Automatic annotation (TrEMBL), chains A, E:
<comment type="similarity">
    <text>Belongs to the picornaviruses polyprotein family.</text>
</comment>
<feature type="domain" description="Picornavirus capsid">
    <location>
        <begin position="1"/>
        <end position="169"/>
    </location>
</feature>
<comment type="subunit">
    <text>Interacts with capsid protein VP1 and capsid protein VP3 to form heterotrimeric protomers.</text>
</comment>
<comment type="function">
    <text>Component of immature procapsids, which is cleaved into capsid proteins VP4 and VP2 after maturation. Allows the capsid to remain inactive before the maturation step.</text>
</comment>
<protein>
    <recommendedName>
        <fullName>Genome polyprotein</fullName>
    </recommendedName>
</protein>
<comment type="function">
    <text>Lies on the inner surface of the capsid shell. After binding to the host receptor, the capsid undergoes conformational changes. Capsid protein VP4 is released, Capsid protein VP1 N-terminus is externalized, and together, they shape a pore in the host membrane through which the viral genome is translocated into the host cell cytoplasm.</text>
</comment>
Automatic annotation (TrEMBL), chains B, D:
<protein>
    <recommendedName>
        <fullName>Genome polyprotein</fullName>
    </recommendedName>
</protein>
<comment type="function">
    <text>Protein 2B: Plays an essential role in the virus replication cycle by acting as a viroporin. Creates a pore in the host reticulum endoplasmic and as a consequence releases Ca2+ in the cytoplasm of infected cell. In turn, high levels of cytoplasmic calcium may trigger membrane trafficking and transport of viral ER-associated proteins to viroplasms, sites of viral genome replication.</text>
</comment>
<comment type="similarity">
    <text>Belongs to the picornaviruses polyprotein family.</text>
</comment>
<comment type="function">
    <text>Protease 2A: Cysteine protease that cleaves viral polyprotein and specific host proteins.</text>
</comment>
<comment type="subunit">
    <text>Capsid protein VP1: Interacts with capsid protein VP0, and capsid protein VP3 to form heterotrimeric protomers. Five protomers subsequently associate to form pentamers which serve as building blocks for the capsid. Interacts with capsid protein VP2, capsid protein VP3 and capsid protein VP4 following cleavage of capsid protein VP0.</text>
</comment>
<comment type="subunit">
    <text>Homodimer. Interacts with host GBF1. Interacts (via GOLD domain) with host ACBD3 (via GOLD domain); this interaction allows the formation of a viral protein 3A/ACBD3 heterotetramer with a 2:2 stoichiometry, which will stimulate the recruitment of host PI4KB in order to synthesize PI4P at the viral RNA replication sites.</text>
</comment>
UniProtKB/TrEMBL annotation, chains F, G:
<comment type="similarity">
    <text>Belongs to the picornaviruses polyprotein family.</text>
</comment>
<protein>
    <recommendedName>
        <fullName>Genome polyprotein</fullName>
    </recommendedName>
</protein>
<comment type="subunit">
    <text>Interacts with protein 3CD.</text>
</comment>
<comment type="subunit">
    <text>Interacts with RNA-directed RNA polymerase.</text>
</comment>
<comment type="function">
    <text>Protein 3AB: Localizes the viral replication complex to the surface of membranous vesicles. Together with protein 3CD binds the Cis-Active RNA Element (CRE) which is involved in RNA synthesis initiation. Acts as a cofactor to stimulate the activity of 3D polymerase, maybe through a nucleid acid chaperone activity.</text>
</comment>
<comment type="function">
    <text>Capsid protein VP0: Component of immature procapsids, which is cleaved into capsid proteins VP4 and VP2 after maturation. Allows the capsid to remain inactive before the maturation step.</text>
</comment>
Length: 190, 215, 241, 215, 190, 50, 50
């Protein structure tokens, strides 16, 4: 339903549904590195650690469950080669804090995208808007996105799906919670 | 509309590196690896202007044209002006996977496989065009991955790319009078192709190898 | 032999000329290029992508709070919500956007901008806002009825969640760029009160976007001053000993 | 009849500026903005001959070709003649809306956006063609208006036009012996178009910014 | 009646008539800067201070009222970009002494045109001659005359209409007076 | 390579020659010219005015 | 005479360029080549031998 083909390119059907995250009024955001998220689940993960090689696209579906009395806006953006950065040190991020698996991570500074760039300009990447008063779902189709024709799934994350609440969730009660469900369906997985 | 093309936007010569070195009768072990020569790994993420301009894209593919400008001067004034004797300099492009010189008289200077250019100070600046040297189809400005297969690898360092290393030495055997020579390297990307534009950098850079931000 | 003579300016390094140079490795064959989606051929396509504006221009606003202005039930009618000066090079709401960031790399800019405002309140929230455009040769309006005299749009966000405002063609080069910034304003006023159901939140937020139309033009590329100035970075000298 | 065309009438090279500057070991703050470099805003209303010739028209549109002639000499004679060491000079064209250098070692000298030319004293004079740099369709020789929007603006100064600023420095780090170098700048308008001819000036000029007359 | 198209170019009908000036035997001349003259009168002035922009030509009609016993010659010349100058100082003319409005100004040194040029060569500009023994009216049509396609009427005067008596007015009595009427009709005013 | 030799008068500045020079800003596009009335193409037209 | 100017990088030795040079003995005729079996034209044929 109104999918977004990234960069105007259209490259199975398992739709690995990750554990839903809780959107609170103080949430900063969540991110998943696409090859790493599915590296430990399903036939995708089994084939990934069976072979030294991998080549495929992705299909992303993000859905929220909220009532008509809820308000908020989400930016569902897929960042290619989202090389993260540290906040107050010159040392590079480590393997533990980069490869978060299917659990994913949270944005420390969503304003600067944990990269030092601007969130306001993040719309240049393939993205969709989830405004709770108009829609509650977003679908993005991701192409190959690699300089090399071949890649190592266990060492390089080609895509990073980021969900950032631009407008915080709100309702009459001071505490609000709205589940967010992320489903990833690799296509032509190798 | 032609001025704002990517090729015109990025193809501007810039002082990628500038490093002087003395050469006075360096028979002793004074200033190891700086006796009469200097080396510079060819990396584009050295000056913040070029960093911010190039980091507007995810993948780049270009040929680097290098012009070397050398000047010689002395502040000692131990004798008359007597002019400046004409020195011949050797600039050798050592690509990745090859051995770089460690001393001014190392046998790597006469390898016969590494491309080398010999030019004089009085001559116009030497120009060479380094082609697209990458095993992949494009350079990775940003790399969301780890170099080595072991977990001790560095984040963001692509073992691909790595254009190469540039070494410059004074060919002349050390003359009785020492001299200070300054070599300026200007790189101008050519035939540039860019993919996947990215938000501009907003915070000051913290390191040449990390995307770390202050704040 | 061909008789030749040397013209003035021979043997000079221009740093801007385009002359073919000697290939360092003539026999080397570069890796063939494959199709990578998302190719950029002109930088005008970058500024045609909408990016969020820092509409909340209040000084105390920092970080994420700068991207949204809050409308509350207690906000009075005929009250100014925000004003957006129309000078991308000027430090304001348009500064930290794609259009402003790219335009600061050039000297002369000309074209028309397009603004989109998105209401991010509850489904049943209702109200009316007035979006007025002030031409460069005028004063920024301060009251609702003064704003209503000029070109304006009465936006009912209870029916339409998004409204698009097209700024007419403007040449920033002619309009007072260090001629020694009143280049035009876009202001919003609260026409009615904000009405929300008892179960919804009392406060709603507005999100604004800006993009450049296809008629935009940039000329005389320069050095961007927003890089943060040249400081030496760590691991620089140790990288290329 | 060809000799009396406007192009032939106005397209004659003229010494628009000539300014020598010393460079001797200027580590101290002696002669600020004159330590080892000089700057010159590119204005055609500097010499009275060219002023009177150009002020025969109201609007002009031309490209300025700049040739720089540099000579080096010394009167101290603190040592033997010893010749004159070959110095490399950098001439950077800073257009309007860009930052001009304030010192010889300022980072603006390596901007990478301002066009720059490196030439040696022994080389032939350096030549560069500055294009028509104006936001309007033609330069305004006379401007019956005020620059700024406030009433404090200057009369006759068009905030348009303003071709740019030209800065010349000695690239070589200060050698032990100081030297006096004189740079001569010759400008020759090319592809000239003229509109609205005006009566010739009859009274001596009183200022470079006013049409004031004595009498 | 025998109009003069400036520079052979032909680019409403209000014909704002300024207050008549008195031509005496000792008059040096009068000048009006065309955008400034109409900046404070009529729909032209209202539109000029309503907008930041202006683009139009001009139509000038100058008429004298004299008998057959009067003598004198007038030079009605329209000077484009008439940048004035001071007489015995190096400081530029000020806003007060440049922008005279619809009142206009008088020539301090008509011989040098208050510019330092020559009045004798002022005929190179679009001009008409009013010789009282042959004619008493002059009409000039003025084109756009601006380097830029657009202009600011409140800061830049594109034209300067100058009326200079080359031959002084004379009659049997030592004191003579002849009214001069100036009418300006902007065309396609913006 | 083309065998060449230098003629007398090479490397001299004439101040009257018309030789093409290197554009300082090759990528810059100058402002397009519009029609301005009163163009002067030859100075003989100036002296033909009384 | 042809007006020329010297580009940057003139008079430099690259050790990799392929420029025609002056024959040391223009009049000397080298010995004509005969057919020698086992000619190698590409080094890929060498590594294709087990």
């Amino acid at each position: 339903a109104n999918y977004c083909c990234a960069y105007g390119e259209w490259p199975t059907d398992r739709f690995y549904t990750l554990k839903s995250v809780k959107w609170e009024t103080e949430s900063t955001g969540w991110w998943w590195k696409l090859p790493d998220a599915l590296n430990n689940i399903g036939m995708f993960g089994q084939n990934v650690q069976h072979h030294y090689l991998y080549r495929s696209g992705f299909l992303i579906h993000v859905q929220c469950n909220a009532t008509k009395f809820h308000q908020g806006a989400l930016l569902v953006v897929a960042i290619p080669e989202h090389q993260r950065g540290a906040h107050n040190t010159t040392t590079s991020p480590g393997f533990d804090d980069i490869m978060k698996g299917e659990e994913g991570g949270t944005f420390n500074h969503p304003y600067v995208l944990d990269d030092g760039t601007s969130l306001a300009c993040a719309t240049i990447f393939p993205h969709q808007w989830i405004n709770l008063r108009t829609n509650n779902s977003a679908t993005i189709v991701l192409p190959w996105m690699n300089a090399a024709p071949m890649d190592f799934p266990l060492r390089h994350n080609q895509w990073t799906l980021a969900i950032i609440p631009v407008v915080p969730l709100g309702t009459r009660t001071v505490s609000s919670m709205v589940p967010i469900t992320v489903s990833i369906a690799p296509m032509c997985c190798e | 509309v032609s001025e704002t093309l990517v090729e015109n936007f990025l193809s501007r010569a810039a002082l990628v590196s500038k490093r002087s070195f003395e050469y006075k009768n360096h028979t002793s072990s004074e200033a190891r690896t700086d006796k009469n020569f200097y080396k510079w790994t060819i990396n584009t993420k050295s000056f913040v202007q070029l960093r911010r301009k190039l980091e507007l894209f995810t993948y780049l593919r270009f040929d680097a044209e290098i012009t070397i400008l050398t000047t010689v001067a002395v502040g000692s004034n131990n004798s008359t002006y007597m002019g400046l004797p004409d020195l011949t300099l050797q600039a050798m492009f050592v690509p990745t996977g090859a051995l770089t010189p460690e001393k001014q008289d190392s046998f790597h200077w006469q390898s016969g496989s590494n491309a080398s250019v010999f030019f004089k100070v009085s001559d116009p600046p030497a120009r060479m065009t380094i082609p697209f040297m990458c095993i992949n189809s494009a350079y990775s400005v940003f790399y969301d991955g780890f170099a080595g297969f072991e977990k001790n690898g560095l984040y963001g360092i692509n073992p691909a790319d790595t254009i190469g290393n540039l070494c410059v030495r004074i060919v002349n055997e050390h003359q009785p009078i020492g001299f200070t020579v300054t070599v300026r390297v200007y790189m101008k990307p050519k035939h540039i192709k860019a993919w996947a534009p990215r938000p501009p950098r907003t915070l000051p850079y913290m390191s040449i190898a990390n995307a770390n931000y202050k704040g | 032999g061909v008789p030749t003579y040397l013209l003035p300016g021979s043997g000079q390094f221009l740093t801007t000329d385009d002359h073919s140079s000697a290939p360092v490795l003539p026999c080397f064959n570069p890796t063939p290029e494959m199709h990578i989606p998302g190719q950029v051929r002109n930088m005008l396509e970058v500024i045609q992508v909408e990016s969020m504006m820092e509409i909340n221009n209040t000084e105390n606003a920092v970080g994420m709070q700068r991207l949204k202005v809050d409308i509350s039930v207690l906000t009075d009618v005929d009250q100014l919500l925000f004003n957006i000066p129309l000078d991308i090079q000027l430090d304001g709401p348009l500064r930290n956007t794609l259009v402003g960031n790219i335009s600061r790399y050039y000297t002369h800019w000309s074209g028309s901008l397009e603004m989109t405002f998105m209401f991010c309140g509850s489904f049943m929230a209702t109200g009316k806002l007035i979006l007025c455009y002030t031409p460069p040769g005028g004063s920024c309006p301060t009251t609702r009825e003064t704003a209503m005299l000029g070109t304006h749009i009465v936006w009912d966000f209870g029916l339409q969640s998004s409204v698009t405002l097209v700024i007419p063609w403007i040449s920033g080069s002619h309009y007072r760029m260090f001629n020694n910034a009143n280049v035009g304003y876009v202001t919003c006023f609260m026409q009615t009160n904000l009405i929300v159901p008892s179960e919804s939140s009392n406060t709603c937020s507005l999100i604004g976007f800006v993009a450049a139309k296809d008629d935009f033009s940039l000329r005389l590329m320069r050095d961007s001053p927003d890089i943060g100035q040249l400081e030496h970075l760590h691991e620089a000298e140790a990288a290329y000993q």
